[PDB]
Amino acid sequence: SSDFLEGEQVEYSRVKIANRELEANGKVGATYSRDLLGITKASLATESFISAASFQETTRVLTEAAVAGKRDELRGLKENVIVGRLIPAGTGYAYHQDRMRRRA
DNA sequence: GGGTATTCGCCGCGTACCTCTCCTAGCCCGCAAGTATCCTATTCCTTGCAGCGGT
After folding, report:
1. Could you give phi then psi for residue A56, rounded to 5 degrees?
2. Collapsing DSSP states into helix, strand and coil, what is residue A92?
3. SS3 label, residue A55
4. How far is A74 from A51, CA to CA, in rounded Å?
5. d(CA A82, CA A104)
6. Cα separation of A9 and A29, whole Å?
7. Cα separation of A4 and A8, whole Å?
8. Which of A50, A57, A82, A86 could form a disulfide with A92 if both were Cys (CB 3.0 to 4.6 A apart)?
C-alpha cells in the first residue's frame, strides 16, 4: 500500500518511517532488502548534494543533481560549515533544537 | 535477441610551512638620427646690345 516503485533504491530512513506510520492505519507496508555499498559510493548517494559535491568528482554529482532538480536542506555537519552557521553537533545543538521547534 | 567476455575511458591518488625565479610572438609603422647630394657663392676668359661723343 506504499507509493514506491518496484525497483527504486530509497533511503532506509524514509521507507522505515513510511511503513511504521502507515501500519498505524489499515495499510500494508512495503518490503525492503538492505544493501551494502563501499564508502566511496555511499557518500555520493546522499540526499544532501552539497556534501557530495564537496567530496570527489563534483562534475558528475552536480550535473545529475541539476537535471533532477534536487533541493538541499542543510542538516549535515559539513554544509552548515560551508554556509557558515552553527553546527548541529556540539554546543550549537541547543540552538538548532530551538530553531526547529520555532519554525515548525 | 541474449548471456557472456573484452576493451575503453574516466576517476582518484597527505597536511602545513619556508626560499628562489619567471609571466606571449611577431609584424609594422611612425620616427629620430645620420648622411650624400644639390644648389649657392667667389675668381678668370670671350660675346651681344644699348648709350653716346663727334662730326
Report:
1. -75, 170
2. helix
3. coil
4. 9
5. 24
6. 16
7. 7
8. A86
Nucleotides on strand B with an atom closer than 7 A to protein CB?
11-13
End-to-end CA distance of chain A: 28
Distance of CA A21 to the CA centre of its chain: 18
CA atoms within 13 A on the CB side of A97: 6
C-alpha cell at A29: 507496508
Q: Are A87 and A77 in contact (CB under 8 A)?
A: yes
| Interatomic distance A60 CA / B8 C1' (Å) | 19
A56 touches strand B (CB under 7 A): yes
Cell numbers of A100, please? 526547529
Q: Report resolution in angstroms.
A: 3.5
Which residue, chain included where needed, has cell 538492505? A34
Q: Which of A27, A19, A82, A13 is nearest to A52 (CA)?
A: A82
Query: Pick from A51, A55, A6, A50: which is nearest to A31 by CA?
Result: A6
